[PDB]
């Protein structure tokens, strides 16, 4: 994560639903965990997201944002992050059940 130059991202814990946040989410930014009935995690770009939260704020919902260290985990950006992955841990974790 740190050593990859990945754009500047941010998260955040939102009210939505998960299917309304799935409904809801323009590109740039999706939701990264489902917490629970009514707690979804959006994560994305800087901008994008910064757009969300004044978006989501206009209207009545509940966002909190999360200390991910400016980093939006479990989205497109982190494809070149996981590939580094495998390949980093290719040669030290042994397959067991």
């Known amino acids: 994560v740190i050593d990859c130059e990945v754009k500047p991202g ?4 939102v009210e939505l ?3 309304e946040a ?3 989410c323009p590109p740039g930014v999706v939701a990264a965990c489902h917490n629970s009935q009514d707690s979804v995690t959006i994560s994305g770009g800087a901008q994008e997201m910064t757009k969300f939260m004044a978006e989501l704020s206009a209207q009545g919902v509940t966002v909190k944002e999360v200390n991910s260290n400016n980093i939006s985990y479990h989205s497109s950006f982190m494809t070149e992050p996981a590939a580094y992955l495998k390949k ?3 040669k030290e974790i042994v397959p067991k059940p």
């Open 88 to 90: 980093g841990l290719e």
């Open 17 to 19: 639903t998960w299917e």
């Open 10 to 13: 941010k998260m955040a814990a």
């Open 22 to 24: 799935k409904r809801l």
